[PDB]
Amino acid sequence: HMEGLAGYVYKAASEGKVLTLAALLLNRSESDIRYLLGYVSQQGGQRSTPLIIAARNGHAKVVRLLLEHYRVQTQQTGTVRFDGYVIDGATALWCAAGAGHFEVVKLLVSHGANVNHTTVTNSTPLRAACFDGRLDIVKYLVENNANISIANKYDNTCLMIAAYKGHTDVVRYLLEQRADPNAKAHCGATALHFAAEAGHIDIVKELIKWRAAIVVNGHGMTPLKVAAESCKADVVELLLSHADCDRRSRIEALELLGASFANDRENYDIIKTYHYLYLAMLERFQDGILEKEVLPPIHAYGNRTECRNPQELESIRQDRDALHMEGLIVRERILG
Ligand SMILES: CCCSc1nc2[nH]ncc2c(=O)[nH]1
């Protein structure tokens, strides 16, 4: 029933009171030490050890103490509340990368610490740091044999998450190193797709510099066509400017974008809806001629039919109501 002392040892580690930890651990047999330092504590919905919690909270001195003076295994795993969620299989190192405590990361890998050890979702400490964009920690792990190519349970790579979260700094580092831009995920998405849907313009230029392939989403959508739907005009124009997309791919990208400008109540701008929907119409009719098969007018979208000719489109250039409808219809055709 001596686990009462273990709760004081845990509390000392959690709070970073290194001298309190020191006092508690002295005067104790080796049998006692392994017990108190290896006690899995269920405080909260979690499960962790003194070393892990010190790491999770960036208590370097407490962490430096347990390693150099009590030879505590760094392979200890646990379950830890982070940004809302509770992550299972985390080591002191992984927790310290997610929480962004560089100096504790240094301590842990300096001693024995598997930089490639994965959580239950298969997240390396590198992925953690990549999610949060601490370039200092990302650089250090990579330089100590962290594997850039281990991806999570769903093939989400370190580069993909850095692109999604918009860590331009981290993205460029991974590309200069080992990182494969052309990797796909369980849903078909690549680093480019993510960095397109979220409109991280700088990152898209970086991925272009590294000859990343334009491939199709699990939805059959090129990163260009994903930026259209996410109504990311800047990104769409960028991809269109480097790429040599067949007139159809171009037209469908311009339409999907323009259409996305009328409904997207966050970036809603019906006059840009005209700019792109009209531009795609000219591209249709430059001739040698890409005509479009519209859908019959349903009550849901008034009872309008989608403009077939360029002349039909100019007829609503100033009727913001009919253009707001037109966007809903074009997109209804292309996606839904
Ligand atoms: C909030 C700081 C990072 S928490 C986190 N969540 C994840 N989900 N899938 C992988 C990972 C990872 O490496 N870290």
Numbering used by the authors: 0 to 287, 290 to 337
The authors write:
Protein fem‐1 homolog B (FEM1B) is a substrate recognition protein of the Cullin‐RING (CUL2) E3 ligase and plays a critical role in regulating proteins in the cell (Chen et al., 2021, 2024; Hughes et al., 2021; Kramer & Zhang, 2022; Manford et al., 2021; Raiff et al., 2025; Zhao et al., 2021). FEM1B plays a crucial role in balancing the reductive stress response in the cell by degrading key proteins involved in redox sensing and management (Manford et al., 2021). FEM1B binds multiple degron substrates with distinct recognition sequences, which suggests FEM1B has multiple recognition sites for substrate binding. Here, we describe the development of a stable construct of FEM1B, the results of a protein‐observed NMR‐based fragment screen using this construct, and the X‐ray structures of some of the fragment hits when bound to the protein.
